[PDB]
Amino acid sequence: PQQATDD
Amino acid sequence: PQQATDD
Amino acid sequence: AMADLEQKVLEMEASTYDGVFIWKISDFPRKRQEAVAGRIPAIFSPAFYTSRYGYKMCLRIYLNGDGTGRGTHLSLFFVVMKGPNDALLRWPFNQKVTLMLLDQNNREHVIDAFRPDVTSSSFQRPVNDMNIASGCPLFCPVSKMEAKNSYVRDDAIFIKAIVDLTGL
Amino acid sequence: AMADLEQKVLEMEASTYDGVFIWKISDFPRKRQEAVAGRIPAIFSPAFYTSRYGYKMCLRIYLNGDGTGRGTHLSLFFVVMKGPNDALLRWPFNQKVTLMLLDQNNREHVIDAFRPDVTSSSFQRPVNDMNIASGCPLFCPVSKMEAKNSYVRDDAIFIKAIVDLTGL
Amino acid sequence: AMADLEQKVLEMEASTYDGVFIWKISDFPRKRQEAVAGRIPAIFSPAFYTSRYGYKMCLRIYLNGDGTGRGTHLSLFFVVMKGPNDALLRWPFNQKVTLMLLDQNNREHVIDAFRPDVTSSSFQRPVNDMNIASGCPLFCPVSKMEAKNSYVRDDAIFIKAIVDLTGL
């Protein structure tokens, strides 16, 4: 999985 | 089945 | 708008998601009389579902009968309601439905069942909040229930519905 | 007041405790525009759980994408939240997660899956309400959803998440 | 009215319907002192059930003991409550009950169990909201829990109850 950028 | 009369 | 919240709370509290529902009708004598007087012919039950995101359903009873059972029988019907997930469900509704008036002695339950009539408007995807109720006008003779026996105890009766989940 | 209680009731109504969650997103067109405009890039979903006392989780979606998928894809992420029973659970979170955009023709669902990266901060025991979301930045091309097809119907879409319960 | 509604919501959020309940007791230090001081000897847990329409039950604990365990032990009891479906259930209550204080290190849980004494008023069909509780007055030495160990973590403890469903 890849992390979201603005959380 | 039978449907109800006043619904 | 506390009444709206209360309604939501009571509905959530009563909901089941396995197609099995037991409806306790209290104040039987009063409701029974309100029906006989023609003031309140029918009563809708809280909603229940076939699965967490399945069909939404409820029951509709006439303590003094409807149609062919008017004045002589307890008429009990099944209702397909507009569910939040109807778009993901198969239509028309085609699950077998078993209805019961529970003997509180747990010996002689009154039981009937039916399979949906695929062409009836009662089982099509709901356009309105509820489709027309369909079921058993001659579910139970008023003499059998109400009167005495062990169906009515402490001024309350229990109705049970079992929606067959085959294919779901 | 009733605003906070109503809120709690809303969360309870959407919760599930078997790792399976279906998120219906209404007012799609509007929320879709808000994302494209850059006003509201993401939306979090109500919380759900792996079991009655399991992990607390939720989904996070970007109708106009995030990171590598910004402006070209629907980006969908998984979120581990601080749960009431985290102290009794094993960490880091290590259950396979399956994400889906449901085809409302029930034909071609968009699906993807992943197993957590045990070394990512996204799956460590939560210190805050929500850990960093992790998932699929390139989940589905905007042209595939939004545009037409059977993903968007009556201005709504359905997202489904399935958390594998092996070992739980 | 508003109070009862909030109370109903809190009970619903804690309810389980498979005879398994985990009771998280927060603000342990405070409640523990309130017990030692004699201001609040015992605490009741929210209600839970053996099945969707089964027996209604709850737990009752004395953080500083009751009877034989007064001041030395954590006294934990089981309570049969008046359920909405008692008329359909078999009486007296005769299901084995297991009680546990969970070790948050998940190594040494305190566990005890008992089978109901069918002749006791504690297990007859409820006439009042709750029957008299019965259980383990010497469930756990205060020295073992409270003190240190891994039972109290971040000022909270977890009590688990498992009602055997055999025959149900």
Swiss-Prot record, chains A, B:
Kindly list the places in or outside the cell where this protein is found, as annotated in its UniProt entry.
Host cell membrane
Motif Interaction with host TRAF proteins: list the residue ranges: 1-5
Source species, domain of life: Viruses
Post-translational modification (record): Ubiquitinated on the N-terminus.
Q: Where, if anywhere, are coiled coils annotated?
A: none
Q: Copy the domain comment.
A: Two regions, C-terminal-activating region 1 (CTAR1) and CTAR2, have been identified within the cytoplasmic carboxy terminal domain that activates NF-kappa-B.
Q: How does it assemble?
A: Interacts (via PXQXT motif) with host tumor necrosis factor receptor-associated factor (TRAF) proteins TRAF1, TRAF2, TRAF3 and TRAF5. Interacts with human protein ZMYND11; leading to negatively regulate NF-kappa-B activation. Interacts with host UBE2I; this interaction induces the sumoylation of various cellular proteins. Interacts with host IRF7. Interacts with host TYK2.
What this chain does, per the entry, is described as: Acts as a CD40 functional homolog to prevent apoptosis of infected B-lymphocytes and drive their proliferation. Functions as a constitutively active tumor necrosis factor receptor that induces the activation of several signaling pathways, including those of the NF-kappa-B family. LMP1 signaling leads to up-regulation of antiapoptotic proteins and provide growth signals in latently infected cells. Interacts with host UBE2I and subsequently affects the sumoylation state of several cellular proteins.
| Protein family membership | Belongs to the herpesviridae LMP-1 family.
Q: What is the name of the protein in this document?
A: Latent membrane protein 1
Source organism: Epstein-Barr virus (strain B95-8)
From Swiss-Prot, chains C, D, E:
Keyword Oxidoreductase part of the UniProt annotation: no
Q: Which GO terms describe its cellular component?
A: CD40 receptor complex; cell cortex; cytoplasm; cytoplasmic side of plasma membrane; cytosol; IRE1-TRAF2-ASK1 complex; membrane raft; nucleoplasm
Q: Which GO terms describe its biological process?
A: CD27 signaling pathway; CD40 signaling pathway; cellular response to nitric oxide; innate immune response; interleukin-17-mediated signaling pathway; intrinsic apoptotic signaling pathway in response to endoplasmic reticulum stress; mRNA stabilization; negative regulation of glial cell apoptotic process
* Keywords from the UniProt entry: Acetylation, Apoptosis, Coiled coil, Cytoplasm, Isopeptide bond, Lipid-binding, Metal-binding, Phosphoprotein, Repeat, Transferase, Ubl conjugation, Ubl conjugation pathway, Zinc, Zinc-finger
What is an example of a GO molecular function annotated in this UniProt entry?
A: ubiquitin protein ligase binding
Assembly information from the UniProt record: Homotrimer. Heterotrimer with TRAF1. Heterotrimer with TRAF3 (via TRAF domain). The domain containing the RING-type and the first TRAF-type zinc finger can also form homodimers (in vitro). Interacts with TNFRSF1B/TNFR2. Interacts with TNFRSF5/CD40. Interacts with TNFRSF4, TNFRSF7/CD27, TNFRSF8/CD30, TNFRSF9/CD137, TNFRSF11A/RANK, TNFRSF13B/TACI, TNFRSF14, TNFRSF16/NGFR, TNFRSF17/BCMA, TNFRSF18/AITR, TNFRSF19/TROY, TNFRSF19L/RELT and EDAR. Stimulation of TNF-alpha receptor TNFRSF1A leads to the formation of two distinct signaling complexes.
Name this polypeptide is given: TNF receptor-associated factor 2
Q: Where the shown chain sits in the full protein?
A: 334 to 501 of 501
